């Protein structure tokens, strides 16, 4: 049903010691598959399916865009410095554009930008006009409307983006459609007169998972602390929840784990 393509850039003035200033990255269904670097100057695959099922002209043609996309962002950084009347320092340019599809057809199409952690511009496809969030982005709105780049973006977001996305899903249908089961461990420790239990699901896929604490067969969303869902190195996800409770009450609490991989939601109890 729902498949999402998203490309993302990050041009930086002060990236750090021994780090690249510009990086361009792509994501399919919330999973990293394509990567570009300013040091390497070539697009490279992160997943197996995109690497296996792609010719050289795909990479060479994509690299020419990446080397292009690197060059404009060098010019951009300099343009904003003069527009804001800034001497220099730690500034960054961000780009965020993609396309969503449901049962074949497209639903959403976006093309945005932010400067120094704040929205700069955004392409509204329905009205066929770019929006100026900040007074410093008003010149860009006039530039991008006079020269109809909006016609070019509509062609990309609706036609180009979708045709490539359908192909990417077909290549990694097995690797996107797979399901991995979470290795769950329950543990608790005394803090300062208060027992602090903690459920910890390790390696699982897909991303969205529901983990909660059940006191006496009843969901307790009070006193529960969660750190959200966080990624791993090998294309899988991790989560963690903890609950403050009275000492001795160990058998009362239970960690329920609801996930797509599991048909029945598995309950876990603390037993050492």
């Amino acid at each position: 049903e729902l498949h999402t393509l998203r490309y993302i850039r990050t041009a930086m003035t002060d990236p750090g010691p021994g780090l690249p200033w510009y990086v361009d990255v792509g994501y399919v269904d919330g999973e990293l598959f394509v990567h570009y670097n300013s040091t390497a100057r070539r697009y490279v695959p992160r997943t197996e399916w995109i690497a296996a099922k792609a010719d050289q002209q795909y990479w060479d043609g994509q690299t020419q865009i990446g080397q292009g996309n690197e060059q404009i962002d060098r010019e951009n950084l300099g343009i904003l410095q003069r527009r804001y009347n800034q001497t220099g320092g730690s500034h960054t340019v961000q780009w965020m554009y993609g396309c969503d599809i449901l049962e074949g057809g497209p639903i959403r199409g976006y093309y945005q930008m932010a400067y120094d952690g704040r929205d700069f511009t955004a392409f509204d496809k329905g009205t066929m006009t770019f929006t100026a969030a900040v007074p410093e982005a008003v010149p860009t709105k006039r530039k991008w409307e006079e020269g109809d780049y909006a016609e070019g973006l509509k062609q990309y977001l609706e036609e180009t983006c979708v045709e490539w996305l359908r192909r990417y899903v077909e290549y990694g249908k097995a690797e996107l459609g797979r399901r991995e089961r979470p290795e769950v461990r329950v543990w608790g420790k005394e803090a300062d007169g208060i027992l602090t239990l903690s459920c910890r699901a390790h390696g699982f896929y897909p991303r969205p998972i529901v983990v909660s604490w059940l006191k006496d067969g009843a969901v307790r969303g009070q006193d529960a602390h969660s750190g959200g869902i966080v990624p791993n190195g090998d294309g899988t996800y991790h989560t963690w929840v903890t609950i403050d409770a009275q000492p001795g009450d160990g058998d009362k609490y239970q960690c329920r784990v609801e996930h797509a991989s599991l048909p029945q939601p598995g309950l876990y109890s603390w037993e050492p």
């Binding site: 490309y7 994509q62 990446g66 996309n69 010149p139 991008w144 780049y149």
Partner: peptide
């Protein structure tokens, strides 16, 4: 597949 440009700000 990425989109080239279109142009500077």
């Amino acid at each position: 597949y990425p989109y080239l440009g279109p142009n500077t700000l």
